[PDB]
Design an enzyme around this catalytic site. Sequence first.
Site: not given
Ligand SMILES: CCC(CC)O[C@@H]1CC(C(=O)O)=C[C@H](n2cc(CCCO)nn2)[C@H]1NC(C)=O
Ligand SMILES: [Ca+2]
Lengths: 388, 388, 388, 388
Positions: A69-70, A196, A211, A216, A242, A288, A322
Amino acid sequence: TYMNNTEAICDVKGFAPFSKDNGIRIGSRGHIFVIREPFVSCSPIECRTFFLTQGSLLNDKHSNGTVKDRSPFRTLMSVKVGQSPNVYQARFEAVAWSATACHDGKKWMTVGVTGPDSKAVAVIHYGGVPTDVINSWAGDILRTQESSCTCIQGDCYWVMTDGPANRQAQYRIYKANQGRIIGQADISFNGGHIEECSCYPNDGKVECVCRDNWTGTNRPVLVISPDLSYRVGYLCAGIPSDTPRGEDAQFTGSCTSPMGNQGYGVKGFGFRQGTDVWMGRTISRTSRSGFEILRIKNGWTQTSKEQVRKQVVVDNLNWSGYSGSFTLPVELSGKDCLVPCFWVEMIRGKPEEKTIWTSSSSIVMCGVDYEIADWSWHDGAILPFDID
Amino acid sequence: TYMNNTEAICDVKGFAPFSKDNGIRIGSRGHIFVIREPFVSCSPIECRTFFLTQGSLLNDKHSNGTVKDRSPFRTLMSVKVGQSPNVYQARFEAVAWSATACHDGKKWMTVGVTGPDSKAVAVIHYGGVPTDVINSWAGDILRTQESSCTCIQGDCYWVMTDGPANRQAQYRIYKANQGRIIGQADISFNGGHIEECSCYPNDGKVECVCRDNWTGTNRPVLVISPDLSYRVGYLCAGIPSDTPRGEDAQFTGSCTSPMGNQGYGVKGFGFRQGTDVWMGRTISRTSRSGFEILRIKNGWTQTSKEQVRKQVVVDNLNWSGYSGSFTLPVELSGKDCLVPCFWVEMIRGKPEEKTIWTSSSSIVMCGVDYEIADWSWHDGAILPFDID
Amino acid sequence: TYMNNTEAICDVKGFAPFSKDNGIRIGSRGHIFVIREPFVSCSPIECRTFFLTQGSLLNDKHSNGTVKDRSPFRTLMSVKVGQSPNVYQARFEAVAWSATACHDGKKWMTVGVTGPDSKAVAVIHYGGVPTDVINSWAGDILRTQESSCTCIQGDCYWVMTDGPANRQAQYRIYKANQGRIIGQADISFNGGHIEECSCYPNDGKVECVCRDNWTGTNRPVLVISPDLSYRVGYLCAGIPSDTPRGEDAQFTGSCTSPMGNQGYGVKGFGFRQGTDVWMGRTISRTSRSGFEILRIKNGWTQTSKEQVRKQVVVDNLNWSGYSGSFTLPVELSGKDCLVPCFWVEMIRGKPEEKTIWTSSSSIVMCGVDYEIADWSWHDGAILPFDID
Amino acid sequence: TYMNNTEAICDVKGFAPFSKDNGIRIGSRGHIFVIREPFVSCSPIECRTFFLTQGSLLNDKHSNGTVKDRSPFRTLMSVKVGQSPNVYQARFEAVAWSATACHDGKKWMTVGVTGPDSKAVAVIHYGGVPTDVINSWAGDILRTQESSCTCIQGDCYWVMTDGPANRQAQYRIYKANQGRIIGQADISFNGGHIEECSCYPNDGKVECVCRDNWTGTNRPVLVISPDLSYRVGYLCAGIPSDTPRGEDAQFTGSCTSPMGNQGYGVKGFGFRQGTDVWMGRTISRTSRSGFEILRIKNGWTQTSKEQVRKQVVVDNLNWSGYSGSFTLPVELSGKDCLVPCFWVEMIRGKPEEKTIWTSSSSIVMCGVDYEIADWSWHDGAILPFDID
Ligand SMILES: CCC(CC)O[C@@H]1CC(C(=O)O)=C[C@H](n2cc(CCCO)nn2)[C@H]1NC(C)=O
Ligand SMILES: [Ca+2]
Ligand SMILES: CCC(CC)O[C@@H]1CC(C(=O)O)=C[C@H](n2cc(CCCO)nn2)[C@H]1NC(C)=O
Ligand SMILES: CCC(CC)O[C@@H]1CC(C(=O)O)=C[C@H](n2cc(CCCO)nn2)[C@H]1NC(C)=O
Ligand SMILES: CCC(CC)O[C@@H]1CC(C(=O)O)=C[C@H](n2cc(CCCO)nn2)[C@H]1NC(C)=O
Ligand SMILES: [Ca+2]
Ligand SMILES: [Ca+2]
Ligand SMILES: [Ca+2]
């Protein structure tokens, strides 16, 4: 001149295709960013597609492990809506692994949240250039909308989140003027969970469908006046939107408490239509996959399950993910109201597919005055790719 | 200010090359869309090449099966005329597997027809953004021009088709103002068949040469005033200009009935020149190979076979296909009349060639005041490609 | 109107990310220039990233031997800040293997130094087009800033160097108006050594922090009024900021003499903050790895070692290299002062890595009013590439 | 407003680098057109590089046999000067296997000569769009400058050639206004031979240095007033500047007759400087290798061999080829005179090199007020490529 978003949302009956970029089909060969979290937002004259690159390209070794993610390679960039995030058309917006962006009438403002999890920093850009900053206030993954922010007569508003992922976090609202922050508000949501937020202008105030990653399976709702006095709770509708959620009959709705005892969540949107609500949800209640949007008679103000209209954008054998909100400015649609529009992200690869990478494509939709036939405008890319 | 198309068509003697994009030669290596149905239309300041991508790229696996007509990956995009539909220069216009587009003086309007065959939807864009919609009225493959629409003093006009492919369908005319539909007309053509109309401004009214996919080897003709009272029939000329058709001597012309008993057809164009008509037709009477355009003395108003001028654009050993019409606005040519111009699409690959894919390139031509020598500006790409 | 740079530098507490292009990760697959010496400079409306191509592309044989410094294939080009130096977004600026560029309010001026070492020539461009020239005055590798020049009310100023690399060379200042040179000054720096000056506007005069490739492990300082009467010396701070340098305790500071007896050097920057100084330095005191910037209480005017603030941009396990200065024009930041900003170049490949080539990426930072958390936004590309 | 070219040519002492695109080094990997005949011409605000694509790309099978001169795949396109003819930056200009282009102040005019040899057609474009035509008048390879045409106060002038390659052909001058031809003149040059004229504004009239492909190893000269009364002959200079030519001592100069008995030729340029002349010539007297430009005292008006200045742009171990002329409009250089500038084309591949293809790169130069050191900014690409 500063752009108007005073107007009411056009009561719409159905949604018609705005665009589809085919990024991953195209990316098989062309030079397209590995991304996630695409979203849309419009200026007086164009609609643009923001997104988060994984600092690498499709079909390249560097796309390995792009399910994370980061990373510090993460940036926010933009293109004209419907265009793919290809290297040579993407404008640079910000370094970000979580983001939001919008237009106030004069220039683009963008928020870029990057850094270590314990101490993230949100860099506000305006006119491409950094103007203001917010440091992590709770030390756990400062983050925000991943969908367009909102600007009502020159001042811009959006929602962020700091804290744990599956317990009580903390939610703040922010207000800025030309990239400069001029106000803020802490949201009181004990036992609630807001992430989000998919927002839009409506009657002169900001309405977001967010979200709940805690308990929930219905979605938090936050209605924000410009003085920053809000009113917060959940989407009254007696239908869970959701993912994952439980069945429709097996759901009790609440404008107040969170409902269901499924963890997790996914980003999604809703549009208040007078009293009714358009809600989007992936078709599959577990996975999804698929997409569909339902008009519910009085589902915004009351806990109703009355589906007056249904429409399918992605079928259930196809991946999605999303989805979020934005509006077409009156200076773009010529309508005396702000056309509701949305987009769906369509994730492919890891974790579900036999690839070293994860990415997604999009289809944008928009509110027209008639019912539109069901179909499935899916990603449509053949997997694995060659890099795999 | 709204753009003028009141003017008369310049009586032209010959046509001179406007452009050629070499998309498929180039696509061997560069990143070019797999497409079909290219076409042209001009603004006060530029001429652009619209087209339908197969949501994939040349020399890529995703170009497999791109002979199919209607997929959800299908989009309409545009480039500057003469430029190839490469990824990084193409603007997004609409999702479409059938389309038309034009300029009213202020912005571009585009119609994007996508969806399931039984229930297609046409999304009108204006200024890039969706403004209006028409749902399938007859439930069988709603479709339209695949060549420029027409805008006469701010209001735009075009022709669509719903119904079966080889029997009586139904034909409608549409009229819009800034992406907003303000009128319509059902065409009465019992025993006739109108498809893929190649239109243009002329004397203040809209004149289209269309395709008969039923029985006619001559082409339907529809002359449309702005009040939507039309007059419909066939191209008087005693020379067949569809494909396939029968020989010239073996043809009886009619301004009224369809002629020949060959099924099928191909998109084509005609230009009324006072009383004469410029008509385009693929050289081969059976196959989509070669191209040539003939001026026929009084072939518009009378059933004449008098060819005063001939010119060859693609020779018969070379592939071609669709061809259509558009004009250069007075604000572009400086001429006191609307220069007639056309383009020819040049299809390659499947079904005739040893490739997994199907696509095409183009050469645009334009009316000058002199006779131009014959030649063959063909696609010129070497097949198969590597993906094959 | 001519652009203002009269203003004072915003006293800043920390720096926040402006951009990151990911050129080398991206270059694995996309078409990106092999480069070095990237830098930034801003116009009233955009910030741009200048750079020196090796006239070839990443992952290509032609990138062999791209560790060399001066080839005739060398050019200066530009992109929007944060965008990578990819072929299709790069504007042409000049032929150069050493350069500098800036904006006066009306157009861009750029200096392109190319040619044989014994007789280099600097071509001044203004508005893209060559306007003036300076020939080598000392016959040994005429060269300049490799970071933005400075323009204060329509007239532009910058610093060049001719002479040997590790002994007394000669240093000149130049002043021009619309690409036309209207003044010059020879700097008297006996026993000193000035190279690659990182400058910026401040109080109506030009302040540069330069490189000592002779003996100093502290950095030369040159403060330049518009009448070309300067004042020259070293950065008072009692902390060495060149590379290589010796330890901090093992360093005596001097506003006057050079200090340390390590040869060599690297390009770097400093920002005067009233009396304090922000200084950048690679973390490793020996190798070009890591990066960090320190605010030193009174380190500009006095030989202090008081670090009031520290921040890390690239960690020590990661490569970096050159770093330099530029400001955001008031017409861009809306601030009543010129936001200090900088960038770090991040070199990869030869000589340290197992590649046939050498190149680099960048992260730009900018001065905000708060402390920003430490992190490492490194190049992040996997080596070797396929060409290797 | 119409652009001025009344002014006198700046007396220049030396030439300084304007640009270099590195197209073939870059083309090894990037997507660059196979081309020849590059050239330059400037607008009030930019300088652009026109060229003739072989309708295919470097490193692609379609680049086979690209040594041929005239194919129907041939087009004229343009880029910003110094940028390579890459697909995604090239604008479409015209279909052409011989061309010329320039700017009148308001829009670009371009001439595109294509078609069969016996009956070529020149399509005049203005504002991108076809406006006028000239058909072959002598039936043998109608052709023109392959270097910028000239526009003096709104009306544009250029020179074409029809007839045999190595005997008496026929030479015409053309004059147009906004893409519309308003005059013409047949040049009387019995026993002379004029091709590929390198022209420029000077004192309010058009001066061209052209190529003798018949017998002359000196270059035809044509001085053209706007009333179309010319004066024609050869470059007085007693030094041969064609290729191939004989030695300098072994040459008798003539302002009137052609000199030398070597056939063939190459495109080249000259600049009148008051009485002297700057002349370019490939270094090698036999082969198209190297380049150098000489100022000859009174070599324009008298048959002098007095070289006051010499300068080398490409050394003799390096390939070159065509070279030509253009000026920087006063609205671009700010100079009270029209800066003389030129460019050299640098051919590589077939016939001399081990490749299936032929193409070229460029370096543009410009007149500054000082002598510039010798060097060699050659193509610098490694051959063969992979397609070979
Ligand atoms: C599962 C944790 C969720 C709730 C806090 O975070 C998002 C969950 C997520 C998703 O797909 O469910 C996407 C958000 N995200 C994904 C990414 C990179 C995805 C690369 O495949 N960066 N932020 C995530 N946000 C961050 C700031 O990391
Ligand atoms: Ca939920
Ligand atoms: C043979 C049927 C014909 C008459 C109704 O339809 C067009 C026939 C056709 C042709 O080449 O003859 C082209 C139109 N078409 C083709 C395509 C994709 C072609 C990909 O190779 N999309 N629409 C077809 N139109 C649609 C809306 O599908
Ligand atoms: C070590 C010599 C140093 C001081 C004079 O020169 C710069 C040292 C250098 C560095 O990395 O330390 C960079 C400058 N440079 C590098 C290059 C090309 C680098 C390709 O990898 N062109 N100029 C060099 N400048 C020039 C004009 O050649
Ligand atoms: C040797 C013949 C010469 C004099 C008439 O013609 C030019 C000679 C030539 C040269 O290199 O000497 C270049 C011109 N040319 C080349 C080409 C394509 C070159 C592809 O490698 N098109 N035109 C040729 N011009 C045309 C209109 O064909
Ligand atoms: Ca038919
Ligand atoms: Ca040093
Ligand atoms: Ca000769």
